[PDB]
Amino acid sequence: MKYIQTEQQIEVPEGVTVSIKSRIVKVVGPRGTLTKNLKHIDVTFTKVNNQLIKVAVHNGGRKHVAALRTVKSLVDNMITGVTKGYKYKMRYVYAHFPINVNIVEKDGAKFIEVRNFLGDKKIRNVPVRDGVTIEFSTNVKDEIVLSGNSVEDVSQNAADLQQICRVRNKDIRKFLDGIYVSHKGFITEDL
Amino acid sequence: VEPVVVIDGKGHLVGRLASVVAKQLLNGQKIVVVRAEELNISGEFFRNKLKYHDFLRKATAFNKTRGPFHFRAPSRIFYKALRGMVSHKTARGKAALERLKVFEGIPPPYDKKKRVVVPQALRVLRLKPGRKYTTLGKLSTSVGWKYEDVVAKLEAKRKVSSAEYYAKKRAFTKKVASANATAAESDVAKQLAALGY
Amino acid sequence: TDSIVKASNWRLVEVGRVVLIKKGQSAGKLAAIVEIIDQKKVLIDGPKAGVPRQAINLGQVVLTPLTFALPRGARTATVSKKWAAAAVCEKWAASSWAKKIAQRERRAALTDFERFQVMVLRKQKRYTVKKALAKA
Amino acid sequence: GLRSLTTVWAEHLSDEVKRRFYKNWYKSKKKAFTKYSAKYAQDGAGIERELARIKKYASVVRVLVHTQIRKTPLAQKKAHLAEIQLNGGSISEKVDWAREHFEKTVAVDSVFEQNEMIDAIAVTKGHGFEGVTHRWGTKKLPRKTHRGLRKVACIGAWHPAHVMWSVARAGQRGYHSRTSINHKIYRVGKGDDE
Amino acid sequence: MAHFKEYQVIGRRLPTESVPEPKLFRMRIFASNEVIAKSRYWYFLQKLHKVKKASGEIVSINQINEAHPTKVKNFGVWVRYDSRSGTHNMYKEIRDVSRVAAVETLYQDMAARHRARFRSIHILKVAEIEKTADVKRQYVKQFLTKDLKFPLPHRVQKSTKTFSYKRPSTFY
RNA sequence: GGCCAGCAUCAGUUUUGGUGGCAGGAUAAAUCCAUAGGAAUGUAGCUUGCCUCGGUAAGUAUUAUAGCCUGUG
RNA sequence: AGAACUGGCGAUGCGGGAUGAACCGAACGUAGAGUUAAGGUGCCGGAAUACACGCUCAUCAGACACCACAAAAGGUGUUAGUUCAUCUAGACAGCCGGACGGUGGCCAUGGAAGUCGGAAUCCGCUAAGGAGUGUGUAACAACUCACCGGCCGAAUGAACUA
RNA sequence: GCAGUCAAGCGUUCAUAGCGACAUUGCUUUUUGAUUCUUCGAUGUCGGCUCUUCCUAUCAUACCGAAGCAGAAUUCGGUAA
RNA sequence: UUUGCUCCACACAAUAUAGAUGGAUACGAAUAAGGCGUCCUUGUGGCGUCGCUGAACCAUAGCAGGCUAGCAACGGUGCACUUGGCGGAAAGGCCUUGGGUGCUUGCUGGCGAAUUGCAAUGUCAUUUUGCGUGGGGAUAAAUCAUUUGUAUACGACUUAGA
Structure with a gap:
């Protein structure tokens, strides 16, 4: 029905800074720098009082209005990722075969290899995306920790681990094997 | 109005530009089309790839060598759309097609000449903001064109040379405007302003 | 640290926004938006320029960067008073837009004798520019 | 190109x-x-x-x-x-x-070495005009066949009303350019070496 | 069917010897000319009373002009239309400058959104909305907000030449 | 004195502009002017509460330092 | 296949439907000029890439009577509407707090207390707390929903119509 | 010949894992009819052999989804010629 | 194979044309954004300005454009040379140095035009070939026949022979 004016606000905290060049959002904070290309959405940014940013859509349809809210969420995810960080935690579950995962290095890429998954002799390799820091957890049995700034790079690298250890030609309800997300949190403490 | 009109194919629609050029060719105007690899087609990339595959499977059954020829270059894809807009089987339609030259990128001497655009054929001026469009260079590579990287390497080298030419021209234009501003406050400057000049 | 975001100033369709009719019987006169009917139709009034108050389509007019305080739905007598108070026709004539417009009817009104005089005057001016440009 | x-x-x-x-x-x-x-x-x-x-x-x-x-x-x-x-x-x-x-x-020793797999590019031995039975490997017709049995019986259907490009037919055999790959080198000999 | 006008038409139901001076029924008809206006008048009296063109005459036909043709109003219009399946009743609100102009856009809107032709639309009533917040449709509420300013973040200005020597700019 | 043309003044057919004088409608309706009444997408003022000496925020207030609507003439 | 009325084809070219004996327009001496019919005006193709309001995105869109096919039934795709319900006495969604007292109810018996199961649905306190929505315990425990509130700020829920 | 819609019931309980009555909507021209438009101053008639190509309404192989799928073996469905 | 062949300056001829009659006047990129100018801590920076079409810009006055006299400038422009550099995507073009020479309407003059008789494109292109003058350069092959068999119906193919 072509909503004349729909608008969402973006709250920017103390330490970080946001710079936009005609759609190119650059969020720079204590943990680093994040850049995103949003040139496929066609929204309008405006700075109000150096602590709040407003995004406006003029004469947009229902689908185009639905693309307004995802703009604010993507920028907020970029903002919270450079102050609080993003920390994904997984657990290894197996019935008989202990899954062995180690950090390897070929051609300077820091792959993640998986061994002894359901007794398979094949070594599945998972490449670590840039910005994601992989660390093995302490005092918890079979836990891996994925940490980084970009939520869409930590979770996608996380999704690669979850989808590489699939079970085929068996009953999924019985063979409870895989690398599953346990908790999606933040890197910084107290929050 | 001009002996040879050079049209920049970047940002244009293959169908709306061809219909413009086909009418100009029939009227006896020579047309040169450059940068045919940057032409735009309305609809998503998967739409146009499926349409070309439907065209690709159309061939003469008993001899594939005499059927419809599926050209892969972006210049010839634009030519195929333009060829069907002209009565090319007559002597008048054949003479019109010899007045047209279509190239990928910007070739020699047409690189040192002025390029124009067709306002009723720009993608930005015809498509609603939000509609998906396909680039002819990417579509051609997916169907069998193997010169996308060669043109892109040559086009990048050409832009460096043209940027240096523009810096000399922009600096010379600023020197011209300084002398034209000093030409003001005189008798001949005020008399020209009275006559609209 | 700066939080720079580009502003990208736009001409808003609003009460008091001065329009320039480009298609229709007026074709070049100045009017002001009185009330907004919908997304595509607006109510304009050009009493100083002679434009009758009417409902016009937004495609037949082009908004100007001039704006003056006008109440919503103000009648013709009210619009004409605020037009002269803000001196809209004086600010418009000082803009480069109107000076570029007023230049093009002046060239179109040039006679054959005046077209010859412009040729002579530009040759005298070109002599001074070429002399000044060749010594620096 | x-x-x-x-x-x-x-x-x-x-x-x-x-x-x-x-x-x-x-x-x-x-x-x-x-x-x-x-x-x-x-x-x-x-x-x-x-x-x-x-x-x-x-x-x-x-x-x-x-x-x-x-x-x-x-x-x-x-x-x-x-x-x-x-x-x-x-x-x-x-x-x-x-x-x-x-x-x-x-010399060859500066180009090729032993235990290397190479591709050989050459033109095949020529045989001139050859019938369809040996040129394409088609089955021979029975002995009771009239007007010859070393042919292809059906060369196409009624529709399309043409001879297909993909039907086996007699013609030139041999003298074709071929390149076979994955050929292991066993010896790099020397002419001076007796 | 065209650029409309508003007419008032009075029929009479021609006098018999038994009944002189009949009731003089009246309607308001939206039409392009007086010929269609008189035709639409008889079409509706044939749906309400035992009267037709042969049994009655047209006393008078007068064109009704807008009292304030240059003041933007909100119009609440009730319509009854025939669809491909059955008959339905609608209520819509149109923000326009006159009753005639608001009716003209309704026929365009009814044909666009419901594929209803002019022959399948009956105008039940065109009434003015006196007060704000009595407007029930959201697409009319948007233009009644205080201090309403909206831009046009795209500018496709039409050209007259087949070739231009500069790339167009959609700044606005 | 042929043949082929140009221009002018005409006639027949027709096409495309400029412009004048009148007759009708609610003797157009409006705008406009005068008067009365009224309302908020509530103007000034007043008052309240936050505040980088003022800008906002909600109550009051029907023309005031903005205006509008309706009726009548 | 067989009748009725009328118009056509056959016996009929012409303009249109790309194409066609019947359809639309219109019927024909030889020419000129003007105007139209039906049909069209992005290019092929003579004529506005006219104007105006909307609708539609289709990983087999759609595009014009005769006409060269598509249905029942479906879609939190999108648009418009109908009816009912919540509603200025703060809804919807989310988070958070309580979620019980009489009472392990009358039953059954290796054992059953709101939750294997059969038959009953009341009282107190009150803002609300169902002899209880699911998880679970041999049985209790623990957790949660119904239900009522804390804060957050205006439209929202359901069934249908095309 | 093939495919849907509705869901009374079967399925240990559980309509829709799988099926599925009573009804109803279609598709296909690989069956057989019906018709008599083309051909009786002739289009050589069944089957097999031989050989090419195409269709998908998929038997197998590839990748997946579902199950009253533990494994094994099957069943149903999807992308697919 | 009777002084032939090729190239440049020119002269006379014919032949050919999908159509010269002021100038095809060169950033890139974005379009819910940019161009230009300027400042600055050189940035996704501050400020100013511009668009709303090339309706521009440059060029344009003289017998299709003469003959001459000066003034003011030390420019503008054409041509033949010359210096240096860049350009390979189809470069075959672009930029630049030095002087020579011609014109100059930047300004002021003096003569000439008619009779082509009231309009008749009023000839102003380059395309190839031919032919003569004379200024440079160059001094071969292929095929048939014979022969070979890595080939082959015949042609073709592969070889060889002063």
Whole structure:
């Protein structure tokens, strides 16, 4: 029905800074720098009082209005990722075969290899995306920790681990094997 | 109005530009089309790839060598759309097609000449903001064109040379405007302003 | 640290926004938006320029960067008073837009004798520019 | 596509490669490459100007070589000329390697080694016109067949009303260009080595 | 069917000897000319009373002009239309400058959104909305907000030449 | 004195502009002017509460330092 | 296949439906000029890439009577509407707090207390707390929903119509 | 001949894992009819052999989804010629 | 194979044309954004300005454009040379140095035009070939026949022979 004016606000905290060049959002904070290309959405940014940013859509349809809210969420995810960080935690579950995962290095890429998954002799390799820091957890049995700034790079690298250890030609309800997300949190403490 | 009109194919629609050029060719105007690899087609990339595959499977059954020829270059894809807009089987339609030259990128001497655009054929001026469009260079590579990287390497080298030419021209234009501003406050400057000049 | 975001100033369709009719019987006169009917139709009034108050389509007019305080739905007598108070026709004539417009009817009104005089005057001016440009 | 920019030849060419450019060697005056040899009669600017263009341009560099048929027991007496692409870094030294190898010889041991898999490119043995039974491997018709049994019975349907391009039919057999891959090298022999 | 006008039409139901001076029924008809206006008048009296063109006459036909043709109003219009399946009743609100102009856009809107032709639309009533917040449709509420300013973040200005020597700019 | 044309003044057919004088409607309706009444997408003022000496925020207030609507003439 | 009325084809070219004996327009001496019919005006193709309001995105869109096919049934695709319900006495969604007292109800018996199961649905406190929505315990425990509130700020829920 | 819609019931309980009555909507021209438009101053008639190509309404192989799928073996469905 | 072949300056001829009659006047990129100018801590920076079409810009006055006299400038422009550099995607073009020479309407003059008789494109292109003058350069092959068999119906293919 072509909503004349729909608008969402973006709250920017103390330490970080946001710079936009005609759609190119650059969020720079204590943990680093994040850049995103949003040139496929066609929204309008405006700075109000150096602590709040407003995004406006003029004469947009229902689908185009639905693309307004995802703009604010993507920028907020970029903002919270450079102050609080993003920390994904997984657990290894197996019935008989202990899954062995180690950090390897070929051609300077820091792959993640998986061994002894359901007794398979094949070594599945998972490449670590840039910005994601992989660390093995302490005092918890079979836990891996994925940490980084970009939520869409930590979770996608996380999704690669979850989808590489699939079970085929068996009953999924019985063979409870895989690398599953346990908790999606933040890197910084107290929050 | 001009002996040879050079049209920049970047940002244009293959169908709306061809219909413009086909009418100009029939009227006896020579047309040169450059940068045919940057032409735009309305609809998503998967739409146009499926349409070309439907065209690709159309061939003469008993001899594939005499059927419809599926050209892969972006210049010839634009030519195929333009060829069907002209009565090319007559002597008048054949003479019109010899007045047209279509190239990928910007070739020699047409690189040192002025390029124009067709306002009723720009993608930005015809498509609603939000509609998906396909680039002819990417579509051609997916169907069998193997010169996308060669043109892109040559086009990048050409832009460096043209940027240096523009810096000399922009600096010379600023020197011209300084002398034209000093030409003001005189008798001949005020008399020209009275006559609209 | 700066939080720079580009502003990208736009001409808003609003009460008091001065329009320039480009298609229709007026074709070049100045009017002001009185009330907004919908997304595509607006109510304009050009009493100083002679434009009758009417409902016009937004495609037949082009908004100007001039704006003056006008109440919503103000009648013709009210619009004409605020037009002269803000001196809209004086600010418009000082803009480069109107000076570029007023230049093009002046060239179109040039006679054959005046077209010859412009040729002579530009040759005298070109002599001074070429002399000044060749010594620096 | 790729396009050759210029070609540079050696100062002296043997009669083996000179015989390639003629159809009647015995009648000709053997004037080939006589005026081109005057380019080396200068200080070398005529050849050096062309080499500089190959280093600047020409991202692909190929060498012109010809066989030594006189060491071969064939009676052809005419060498075969072919282009071989150079594999190496820094396009400039490809020209410099070719320049220093003009009129010099290259052996197999500098190109191929033992236990290497190579592709052989050659034209097959010719057999002339051959029937469809042996050219395509089609089954022979029974003995009771009239008007010949070494044929293809049905060459197509009523519709389409044409002979298909994909039906087996008699014609030329052999003398085709083929390249078989994955051929292991077992011995790199030496002629001087008894 | 065209650029409309508003007419008032009075029928009479021609006098018999038994009944002189009949009731003089009246309607308001939206039409392009007086010929269609008189035709639409008889079409509706044939749906309400035992009267037709042969049994009655047209006393008077007068064109009704807008009292304030240059003041933007909100119009609440009730319509009854025939669809491909059955008959339905609608209520819509149109923000326009006159009753005639608001009716003209309704026929365009009814044909666009419901594929209803002019022959299948009955105008039940065109009434003015006196007070704000009595407007029930959201697409009319948007233009009644205080201090309403909206831009046009795209500018496709039409050209007259087949070739232009500069790339167009959609700044606005 | 042929043949082929140009221009002018005409006639027949027709096409495309400029412009004048009148007759009708609610003797157009409006705008406009005068008068009365009224309302908020509530103007000034007043008052309240936050506040980088003022800008906002919600109550009051029917023309005031903005205006509008309706009726009548 | 067989009748009725009328118009056509056959006996009929012409303009249109790309194409066609019947359809639309219109019927024909030889020419000129003007105007139209039916049908069209992005290019082929003579004529506005006219104007105006909307609708539609289709990983087999659609595009014009005769006409060269598509249905029942479906879609939190999108648009418009109908009816009912919540509603200025703060809804919807989310988070958070309580979620019980009489009472392990009358039953059954290796054992059953709101939750294997059969038959009953009341009282107190009150803002609300169902002899209880699911998880679980041999059985209790623990957790949660119904239900009522804390804060957050205006439209929202359901069934249908095309 | 093939495919849907509705869901009374079967399925240990559980309509829709799998099926599925009573009804109803279609598709296909590989069956057989019906018709008599083309051909009786002739289009050589069944089957097999031989050979090419195409269709998908998929038997197998590839990748997946579902199950009253533990494994094994099957069943149903999807992308697919 | 009777002084032939090729190239440049020129002269006379014919032949040919999908159509010269002021100038095809060169950033890139974005379009819910940019161009230009300027400042600055050189940035996704501050400020100013511009668009709303090339309706521009440059060029344009003289017998299709004469003959001459000066003034003011040390410019503008054409041509033949020359210096240097860049350009390979189809470069075959672009930029630049030095002087020579011609014109100059930047300004002020003096003569000449008619009769082509009231309009009749009023000839102003380059395309190839031919032919003569004379200024440079170059001094071969192929095929048939014979022969070979890595080939082959015949042609073709592969070889050889002063």
